[PDB]
Nucleic acid binder design. Structure first.
Ligand SMILES: [Mg+2]
Ligand SMILES: [Mg+2]
Ligand SMILES: [Mg+2]
Ligand SMILES: [Mg+2]
Ligand SMILES: [Mg+2]
Ligand SMILES: [Mg+2]
Ligand SMILES: [Mg+2]
Ligand SMILES: [Mg+2]
Ligand SMILES: [Mg+2]
Ligand SMILES: [Mg+2]
Ligand SMILES: [Mg+2]
Ligand SMILES: [Mg+2]
Ligand SMILES: [Mg+2]
Ligand SMILES: [Mg+2]
Ligand SMILES: [Mg+2]
Ligand SMILES: [Mg+2]
Ligand SMILES: [Mg+2]
Ligand SMILES: [Mg+2]
Ligand SMILES: [Mg+2]
Ligand SMILES: [Mg+2]
Ligand SMILES: [Mg+2]
Ligand SMILES: [Mg+2]
Ligand SMILES: [Mg+2]
Ligand SMILES: [Mg+2]
Ligand SMILES: [Mg+2]
Ligand SMILES: [Mg+2]
Ligand SMILES: [Mg+2]
Ligand SMILES: [Mg+2]
Ligand SMILES: [Mg+2]
Ligand SMILES: [Mg+2]
Ligand SMILES: [Mg+2]
Ligand SMILES: [Mg+2]
Ligand SMILES: [Mg+2]
Ligand SMILES: [Mg+2]
Ligand SMILES: [Mg+2]
Ligand SMILES: [Mg+2]
Ligand SMILES: [Mg+2]
Ligand SMILES: [Mg+2]
Ligand SMILES: [Mg+2]
Ligand SMILES: [Mg+2]
Ligand SMILES: [Mg+2]
Ligand SMILES: [Mg+2]
Lengths: 258, 142
RNA sequence: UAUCUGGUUGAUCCUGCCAGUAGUCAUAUGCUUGUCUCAAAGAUUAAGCCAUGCAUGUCUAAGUAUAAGCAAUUUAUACAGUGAAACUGCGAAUGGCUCAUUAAAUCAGUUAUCGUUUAUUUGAUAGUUCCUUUACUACAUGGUAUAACUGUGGUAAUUCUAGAGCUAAUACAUGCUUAAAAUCUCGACCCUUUGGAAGAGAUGUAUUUAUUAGAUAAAAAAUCAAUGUCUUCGGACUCUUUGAUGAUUCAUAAUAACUUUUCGAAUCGCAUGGCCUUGUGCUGGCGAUGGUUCAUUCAAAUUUCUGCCCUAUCAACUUUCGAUGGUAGGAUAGUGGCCUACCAUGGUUUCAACGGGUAACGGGGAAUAAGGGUUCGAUUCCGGAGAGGGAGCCUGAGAAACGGCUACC
RNA sequence: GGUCGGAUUUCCAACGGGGCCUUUCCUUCUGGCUAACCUUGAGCUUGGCGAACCAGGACUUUUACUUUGAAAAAAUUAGAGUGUUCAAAGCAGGCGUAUUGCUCGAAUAUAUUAGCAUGGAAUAAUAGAAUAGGACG
RNA sequence: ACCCACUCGGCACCUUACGAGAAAUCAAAGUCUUUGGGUUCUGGGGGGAGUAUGGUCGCAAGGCUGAAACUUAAAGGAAUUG
RNA sequence: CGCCCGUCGCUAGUACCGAUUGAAUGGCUUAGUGAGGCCUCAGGAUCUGCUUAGAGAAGGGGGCAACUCCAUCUCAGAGCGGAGAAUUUGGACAAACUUGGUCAUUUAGAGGAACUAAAAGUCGUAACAAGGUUUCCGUAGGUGAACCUGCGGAAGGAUCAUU
RNA sequence: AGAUAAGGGAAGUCGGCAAAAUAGAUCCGUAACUUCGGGAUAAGGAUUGGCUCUAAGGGUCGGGUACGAUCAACUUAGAA
RNA sequence: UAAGGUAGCCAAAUGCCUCGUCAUCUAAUUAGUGACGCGCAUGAAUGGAUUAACGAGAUUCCCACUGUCCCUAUCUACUAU
């Protein structure tokens, strides 16, 4: 009402943050940034609740204000900066590098990566257009604008970003036999090797997707992120690599390693 | 539906200018488009002389959103008809259904000639009037 | 945890209700009350009225400091440490409270903006602006106030203010400094017909209008209107540029101009470095703030479909002066009877219209449940509406704002 | 049992699927992959028919119903794990030479109706060629 | 016109109870806890009360629609022995 | 010697009709008047820049003698403007008030007419047996009261019965 | 005989006698009751001038085997 | 008594007592209206009761309006002179 909201109560936050329902009435509202606040992770909850490197927002602020943490090469000393999918986070102290990817339960994992892998990121192009004076440009999933792309780069493709400059090194197209990451919905976190896509001109192009264990499913085209061709991926996959074990085999593995 | 210039203003498609200096074919420049979704633009719309600002083919509207189907129960308006969509509403206690209906006022272009009893499919557009939000895109009866 | 029992009779079997029985995040009340954890709590009647005190303010290295403030710099004679006040910039439109209004309204799920605004982030993005543009001109940077402050006062009083004297800006209000090339116009002049020219001006972005391009399923030939790039002027002829959407008059570009004319940095902190024709010469980093447009994000506004309790002792309702629609225009951020002019007579209803009632905010949900169901949901989350009742409006990206104003009651 | 109460294969059967044939089109045009290819080079070689991979197409009887899936905020409900000392709860925690550390989690299900995509095509409707202005061609 | 046999459609009747029902009784009042062939109307303890009021019809008498307050633990059905 | 109906009379309670063009409260609304701010037509207090501009006097530079040129105190006067308060025309939004109208909910009322109880009151005995005239329905009339009578109907009859 | 009167407004008088007020037209709105025909001009409100315009409402002639020309009305509505 | 006034209606234009009693209307009402009825002496084609509309009929009240009045004054014409 009357303007934008600036608070976010607990029990209204997205559940994949794993914020406890006790310990405060409010949740850290992500500031405006490159991602939607639903599919984002504030640096406060990432540093405190996933890494345990801090206990308070005061300690997170004390870490941020001395320019220790940087994300996508930029320092970003904001407590509620929305870190989203495949954003890289570099901590020069501890020489740590994380890449924000979903685990198969649908939450963000602490996926430690090396420096040569932290030197880039992939972006799913959302629209290709002609800017002013006829300059073509793309818009990635994190709102990055990249001018003068390759003319073969159409929508729903993946571009590899230099992450020091904003240039494109190469790009992956979108058709059958491509390794994808599911980012959104019930199947959020699986990796499943497109077999074919159905059009349905008028809304919500569907795509059929089968994992390494031949368990197929289907997803809207909004939630799919192609990350290479079948076999080799262009990034380091987290543990499990998006299989979505059933609860039976999950407790069998928990009884195996114990 | 007998003349195009019935109103006090000059009815014309905007920015479709036929130069009087040149003398070519294609009697007047007539702009038309395909609405998409496999709907055929009629030859009477391509060859006619009506203007119909709110036509989904010659007019400056776009069809997007829901596609519905009804039967025409009234034609007494001008370039507007009322269709009746009948549906079954389920009641969970009695484990069975009941007949309900809505009347949907839709805009009809002069490309179509509809009568009472014809079934039509309509496409959602921007608010055309106080009540009209759909536009007749294909008649499929006689 | 799919359970029944007492009461009509002199007695019987029934119908049938009354009473019992169990529960209640349903309240109140009586009596009693030792411990640990957890915890609702002026909703119901009065969205009745309020004493008093708090609940919204805010700074860095980085907008403005001669505090006649505190320090000591001792590196400083412009300042450069801290720093009240005040100007400036943001915020105060979030939160919190309540449920009065409200019955296709809100609200839920589901769409859409190819029908719009969007501070803030985040990512990109202005060599084109000296106007007779050869003195019109500061571009090692241009002007004017004014607060705080000093001092003189008013009234019983208010977060009331007047007169006088200074002084600043990222305050107001002005204003320049950067290529080249290309294309168009005019065009002096030479003058030829094949006709060529010196020179001048315009060409960023933003607004407004008009026009054009924004294409294409296939293959060859006939001649002319004039040859068209170059010729062995036979004509070999290609190269020809066209992105996206299911779909556009889309994105974008180009001509003709239009604008009372937007923007295109006169701002700030640290580090002080390289080249020498050694001059305060020319170059030169890391940031902060600001800035036009696009995209993105936070949203907002409308919007598709379907779904709401009880009433017919409400059956016809709407349309004077908006009801339903058409055309055109105004207005809006935009669609639209949203409003106006003209025109037509339309639109809803026994599949319950309209009207009335609700001790009715809606939903997620809660109680009780063999199953089906019945009742409740003011209330910890979401979405609405309100700030005693109405109405109106300034500022701002965002308010019909009320811990903001104006009027009436 | 060919492992030491865990598992395999040649097996008698049942259970559900797919394809083909029996008069049984169960849409086809432009293109490309030509695919499974008469393609056979001596026992792994030089050359068949487009969906099994697409793009555009022309058309395309309409539903209801039902299956599956996407979506349906969290909290609540049910429910997996876990010494809040039990429990209501909560989402925690657990394990080491505890000197430097390692590691599992924070599931899952339901969430009507409406809307969306998909398989079925019985059941209940609907339409077609009858003064043939019917289909193939 | 009668008689015999048969058949369709009727008004009914007699006997039994497989069945139903509280019973009286019922070839429908059966095929209903083994609860679903299609469909219309009406009732929710007894009074107050088919009253009051409001509509609507009727010349009128009246008809149709039709409450509430209040009051009560029983009224009532079929059979049994007196 | 059971049960049982109604009038009338007393007491108490509930609701109804009711003259009073009753009363009160609340909602909505016609008409009239109409604040406020907003948009517009003006308006111009005041403040202020520029172009000048002339007179009267000071100073300075120059034929050095009157005289000539440039500056300073004075005050008219003219324009070119810019900002601009009060006030003001018209318009739309429109609070609020007044007077009516209408709807809804309570609320007074002489009197009238019901119902319910209470109470062993008065008068009869209408129904239950053939209840002593068989009961009951509809309709009409009448009578102190239950009720009676007429017409038609019913068995819930006191008859399942006369080939 | 005809009139006008401040403030009040039937206190006057048997009694509002007399006088005053109202009045036409257009638009809106119109109750109880009813023999359903009425009541009804119920009650109760608004508007009305001049000037300059706009709109609508007609006749008669005209067409091989849609319209044009011409003439003349007072009726209503609206706007500055 | 021939029959004993029924249905209705009423201090009615009909009620002596009577300015009947109660309620309403008003500050105050022998008036008005609504009720009550042992009604001197109501009452059914002597027609009873009611009644929309109509009425130069009789009566009460309300709004508006006014010199009817508080409380009179002034003017004009024709008289009077
Ligand atoms: Mg935040
Ligand atoms: Mg009994
Ligand atoms: Mg007993
Ligand atoms: Mg009970
Ligand atoms: Mg309440
Ligand atoms: Mg709030
Ligand atoms: Mg930016
Ligand atoms: Mg329009
Ligand atoms: Mg319109
Ligand atoms: Mg309420
Ligand atoms: Mg809320
Ligand atoms: Mg508010
Ligand atoms: Mg209050
Ligand atoms: Mg307000
Ligand atoms: Mg307050
Ligand atoms: Mg369906
Ligand atoms: Mg027979
Ligand atoms: Mg018979
Ligand atoms: Mg009951
Ligand atoms: Mg009952
Ligand atoms: Mg009996
Ligand atoms: Mg006796
Ligand atoms: Mg007796
Ligand atoms: Mg008798
Ligand atoms: Mg007797
Ligand atoms: Mg008898
Ligand atoms: Mg009897
Ligand atoms: Mg008799
Ligand atoms: Mg009986
Ligand atoms: Mg007077
Ligand atoms: Mg009088
Ligand atoms: Mg008097
Ligand atoms: Mg007197
Ligand atoms: Mg008198
Ligand atoms: Mg008179
Ligand atoms: Mg009258
Ligand atoms: Mg009598
Ligand atoms: Mg009398
Ligand atoms: Mg009197
Ligand atoms: Mg009387
Ligand atoms: Mg007489
Ligand atoms: Mg008379």
């Amino acid at each position: 009402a009357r303007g934008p909201k600036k608070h976010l109560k607990r029990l209204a936050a997205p559940h994949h943050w794993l914020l406890d329902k006790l310990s405060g009435c409010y949740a850290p509202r992500p500031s405006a940034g490159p991602h939607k606040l639903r599919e984002s992770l504030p640096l406060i909850v990432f540093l405190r609740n996933r890494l345990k490197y801090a206990l308070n927002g005061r300690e997170v602020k004390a870490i941020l204000m001395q320019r220790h943490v940087k994300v996508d090469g930029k320092v970003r000393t904001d407590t509620t900066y929305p870190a989203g999918f495949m954003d890289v986070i570099t901590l020069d102290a501890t020489n740590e590098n994380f890449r924000l990817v979903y685990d198969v339960k649908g939450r963000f994992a602490v996926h430690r990566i090396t420096d040569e892998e932290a030197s880039y990121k992939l972006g799913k192009v959302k629209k290709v257009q002609l800017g002013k004076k006829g300059v073509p440009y793309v818009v990635t999933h994190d709102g990055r604008t990249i001018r003068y792309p390759d003319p073969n780069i159409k929508v729903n493709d993946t571009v590899k970003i230099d992450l020091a400059s904003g240039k494109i090194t190469d790009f992956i197209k979108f058709d059958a036999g491509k390794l994808v990451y599911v980012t959104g919905g019930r199947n959020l976190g699986r990796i499943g090797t497109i077999v074919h896509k159905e059009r349905h001109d008028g809304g919500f192009d569907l795509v059929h997707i089968k994992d390494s264990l031949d368990n197929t499913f289907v997803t809207r085209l909004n939630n799919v992120f192609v990350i290479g061709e079948q076999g080799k991926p262009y990034i380091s996959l987290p543990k499990g690599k998006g299989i979505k074990l059933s609860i039976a085999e999950e407790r069998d593995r928990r009884r195996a390693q114990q | 539906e007998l003349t195009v210039q019935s109103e006090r203003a000059f009815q014309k498609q905007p920015h479709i200018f036929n130069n009087p200096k040149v003398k070519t074919s294609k009697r007047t420049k007539r702009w038309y488009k395909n609405a998409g979704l496999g709907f055929k633009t009629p030859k009477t719309a391509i060859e006619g002389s009506y203007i119909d600002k709110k036509c989904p083919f010659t007019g400056l509207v776009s069809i997007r959103g829901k596609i519905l189907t009804g039967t025409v129960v009234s034609t007494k308006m001008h370039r507007t008809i009322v269709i009746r969509r009948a549906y079954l509403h389920y009641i969970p206690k009695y484990n069975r259904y009941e007949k309900r209906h809505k009347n949907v006022p839709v805009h009809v272009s002069p490309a179509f000639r509809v009568q009472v009893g014809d079934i039509v499919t309509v496409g959602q557009c921007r608010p055309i009037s106080k009540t009209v939000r759909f536009n007749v895109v294909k008649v499929s009866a006689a």
